[PDB]
Amino acid sequence: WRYGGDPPWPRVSPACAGRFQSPVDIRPQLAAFSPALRPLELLGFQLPPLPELRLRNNGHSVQLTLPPGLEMALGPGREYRALQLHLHWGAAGRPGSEHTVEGHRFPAEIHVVHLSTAFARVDEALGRPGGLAVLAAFLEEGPEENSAYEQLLSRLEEIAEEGSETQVPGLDISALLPSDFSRYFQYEGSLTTPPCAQGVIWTVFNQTVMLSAKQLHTLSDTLWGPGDSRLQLNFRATQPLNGRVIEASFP
Numbered sequence: 001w002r003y004g005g006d007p008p009w010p011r012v013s014p015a016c017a018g019r020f021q022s023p024v025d026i027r028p029q030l031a032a033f034s035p036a037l038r039p040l041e042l043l044g045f046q047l048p049p050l051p052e053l054r055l056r057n058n059g060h061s062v063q064l065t066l067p068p069g070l071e072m073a074l075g076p077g078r079e080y081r082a083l084q085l086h087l088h089w090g091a092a093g094r095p096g097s098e099h100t101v102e103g104h105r106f107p108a109e110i111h112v113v114h115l116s117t118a119f120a121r122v123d124e125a126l127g128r129p130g131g132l133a134v135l136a137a138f139l140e141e142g143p144e145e146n147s148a149y150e151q152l153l154s155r156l157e158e159i160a161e162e163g164s165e166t167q168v169p170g171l172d173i174s175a176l177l178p179s180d181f182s183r184y185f186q187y188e189g190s191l192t193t194p195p196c197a198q199g200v201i202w203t204v205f206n207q208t209v210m211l212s213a214k215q216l217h218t219l220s221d222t223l224w225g226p227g228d229s230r231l232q233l234n235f236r237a238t239q240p241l242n243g244r245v246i247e248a249s250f251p
């Protein structure tokens with residue numbers, strides 16, 4: 001499978017033609033305030049430098065594999081372990097976030113993918129309700145170099161070629177996410193690439209993460225994908241809510 005062309009995604013996986021897919025256009029005026037949504041909790045995200053982590057150009061994204069012991073909770077009794085994180089981005093002067101807000105697309109987006117503690121493996125969780133949970137934050141331009149992102153972005157030259165990888169020291173993974181874990185949107189949807197399995201709990205932070213212009217350019221200008229083609233604009237088209245109500249942790 002690829003972005004922007006064949007094969008048709010439902011031929012690869014019929015789940016890609018489901019009614020309840022991601023990503024979506026978040027319309028905050030249509031979101032339901034749900035006071036039961038408490039601040040997200042993370043434990044073990046501040047890693048020692050060793051062991052190192054794998055950072056991979058898989059031709060569709062740059063993906064950081066996370067080690068065991070990164071615990072995440074959506075609330076009391078809703079417990080997850082982090083598997084990996086990756087990015088979606090645009091091109092020079094074009095945004096490439098997956099989620100949009102009132103039709104606005106942001107420069108880029110981070111996804112931190114988690115597996116329910118009720119499942120031993122990802123493949124057992126696919127398609128099961130709440131089996132997988134993704135934390136999502138938009139990346140925008142700020143005035144400063146973001147030092148957490150710099151740890152990954154300074155290594156993209158090493159993995160420019162499709163299918164390459166490198167090892168990076170552990171870092172504070174939570175520093176790749178916004179500081180505000182209280183204010184977010186949450187809805188049920190799908191993986192945004194094949195196999196597009198439904199049952200995925202999406203949490204999208206209100207607060208954005210700030211990267212420098214140079215950083216955003218490094219992200220969109222360094223990696224190469226399938227063919228002799230640049231790895232850019234690696235986001236799925238917006239999927240309709242189709243009657244799903246997005247929840248908000250704030251009125």
Ligand SMILES: COc1ccc(-n2cc(-c3ccc(S(N)(=O)=O)s3)nn2)cc1
Nearest residue numbers: 111113122123134190191192193194195
């Ligand atoms: C069969 O074993 C499998 C092992 C891993 C996966 N797997 C797919 C994915 C993802 C695909 C797309 C996303 S996303 N963009 O966060 O929604 S995460 N994460 N793990 C799927 C199957």
Ligand SMILES: [Zn+2]
Nearest residue numbers: 086088111192
């Ligand atoms: Zn993603």
